Amino acid sequence: FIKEIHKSIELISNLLFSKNRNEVLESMDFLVLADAFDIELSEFGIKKMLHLVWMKGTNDEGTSISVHLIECYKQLFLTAPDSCNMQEKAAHIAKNLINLSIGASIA
DNA sequence: AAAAAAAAAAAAAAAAAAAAAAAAAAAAAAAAAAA
């Protein structure tokens, strides 16, 4: 089942760049639900979410791709467990933001 | 607080109009021959 889920992550990393809006949105929700667990290649899928910052649209109904990407990365890398103070809230946020740019390419 | 209804968007198939290309017919011009 884990091998088939990894094949699924490999296919959803390609389906992120489709033309339908709801396909991209449910693909992003699937990758967020995978990375809420500790699936190994799921992080790779999250990297291909980062190139969804460019696809813009002035439609103004539902949630767009970038407006959903803000919420996805906010839940992933901009939160901490709520038993923390204000100080280590910012420390965990800054640790996640620093670790987001350690093993990074130019793109 | 949840469910139902209405509106908008998406996908597939079909139809209409315009543009381009092809074919046919008619007319005009030139040259040659005969009385």
Swiss-Prot record:
Subcellular location: Nucleus; Chromosome
Domain of life: Eukaryota
Role played: Regulatory subunit of the condensin complex, a complex required for conversion of interphase chromatin into mitotic-like condense chromosomes. The condensin complex probably introduces positive supercoils into relaxed DNA in the presence of type I topoisomerases and converts nicked DNA into positive knotted forms in the presence of type II topoisomerases. The condensin complex probably also plays a role during interphase.
Similarity remark: Belongs to the CND1 (condensin subunit 1) family.
Additional free-text comment from the UniProt record: Present with 2540 molecules/cell in log phase SD medium.
Subunit structure, as described in the record: Component of the condensin complex, which contains the SMC2 and SMC4 heterodimer, and three non SMC subunits that probably regulate the complex: BRN1, YCS4 and YCG1/YCS5.
Name this polypeptide is given: Condensin complex subunit 1
Lineage, highest ranks first: Eukaryota, Fungi, Dikarya, Ascomycota, Saccharomycotina
Recorded name of the encoding gene: YCS4
Portion of the full-length sequence here: 536 to 642 of 1176
